[PDB]
């Protein structure tokens, strides 16, 4: 059954509510994101209307079979009117396709869903600048002042710089990079990009790619793993046995592989500065785990929420322990009394 920080007082909306079944009294499901957890349960057979993204919306048709007469794409930016209630799409500054919902409820409450996100300083002048907002759902994935972790920008640029380095020493070796959803896209962009390489991948992942309006994508991605230096794989297989075992399918055209899996938060992130990292080695092997995240740290989301002062706040995630929900209400109450809303 649904729960109840995924429905939208005074409408008939939910929001990323695909795994319960039909949901009593809901004539429109919103998806903020293209992510497993969040789609759960969308397919072919699927006979509601989805509001989302133009991405959400690629992704939904060619990857899930949803059936086109179901899928209703909106702009960003821009006001409008669904079943009889405003609403607008923000971008979240989480993976391709990613919003977040304001809703204009018809008796003048205003609702901000944040979906997932990274909330970043310029979302301050986007349509919220504005106005009020009454009921924040806010992703507080991170939200406990241990969590720290570089800006997006300076993770790419320590990976740029560690991989150009290895193959100018090395110019037979093979850079690796792991994936599993959408998302974080701009490592092995910009990876491939130093080294004048496409980036090579399976025919499933080179599909999900083509539907995420990337310009000029022709241009940096290919199917043909012989023709590039650069190759995405699983991130399952990021590991020694996975990558000695993908070393020798390459036809000794290689000697070395540098490896790099993108993680959320780890425990190093107390103690080791960007900088400062360092791989584990095996051999020919190398494998460096970098904090490229895709949801605000601590500091980014308090900023946030201290500009936006909502009236109330509702958490949608770690909301399944009382230490965790005790924990989320004890920062939301000295945001509140710090900044004086
Ligand atoms: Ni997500």
Excluded at 71 to 100: F, Q, R, S, Y
Excluded at 166 to 182: D, E, Q
Excluded at 218 to 245: A, R, W, Y
């Amino acid at each position: 059954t649904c729960p109840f920080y995924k429905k939208i007082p005074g409408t008939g909306f939910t929001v990323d509510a695909f795994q319960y079944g039909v949901v009593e009294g809901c004539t429109a499901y919103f998806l903020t994101h293209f992510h497993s957890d969040h789609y759960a349960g969308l397919s072919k057979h699927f006979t509601f209307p989805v509001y989302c993204s133009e991405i959400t919306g690629n992704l939904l048709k060619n990857k899930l079979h949803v059936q086109e007469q179901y899928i209703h794409p909106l702009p960003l930016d821009t006001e409008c009117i669904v079943n009889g209630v405003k609403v607008v799409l923000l971008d979240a500054n989480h993976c391709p396709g990613a919003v977040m919902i304001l809703f204009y409820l018809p008796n003048g409450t205003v609702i901000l869903h944040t979906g997932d996100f990274r909330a970043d300083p310029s979302m301050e002048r986007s349509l919220l600048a504005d106005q009020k907002v009454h009921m924040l759902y806010l992703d507080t994935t991170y939200c406990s002042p241990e969590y720290t972790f570089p800006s997006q920008q300076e993770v790419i640029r320590f990976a740029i710089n560690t991989a150009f380095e290895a193959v100018t020493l090395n110019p037979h070796a093979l850079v690796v990079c792991g994936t599993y959803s959408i998302g974080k896209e701009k490592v092995f962009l910009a990876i491939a990009d130093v080294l004048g390489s496409k980036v090579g991948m399976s025919q499933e992942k080179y599909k999900t790619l083509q539907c995420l309006n990337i310009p000029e994508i022709n241009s940096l991605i290919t199917t043909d793993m012989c023709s590039s230096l650069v190759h995405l794989l699983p991130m399952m297989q990021i590991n020694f046995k996975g990558l000695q075992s993908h070393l020798k399918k390459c036809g000794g055209k290689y000697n070395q592989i540098l490896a790099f899996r993108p993680t959320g938060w780890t425990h190093s992130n107390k103690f080791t500065r960007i900088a400062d990292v360092i791989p584990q080695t095996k051999g020919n092997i190398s494998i460096y785990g970098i904090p490229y995240s895709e949801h605000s740290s601590y500091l980014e989301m308090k900023r946030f929420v201290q500009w936006l002062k909502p009236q109330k706040i509702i958490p949608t995630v770690n909301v399944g322990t009382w230490k965790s929900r005790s924990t989320m209400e004890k920062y939301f109450r000295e945001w509140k009394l710090e900044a004086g809303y």
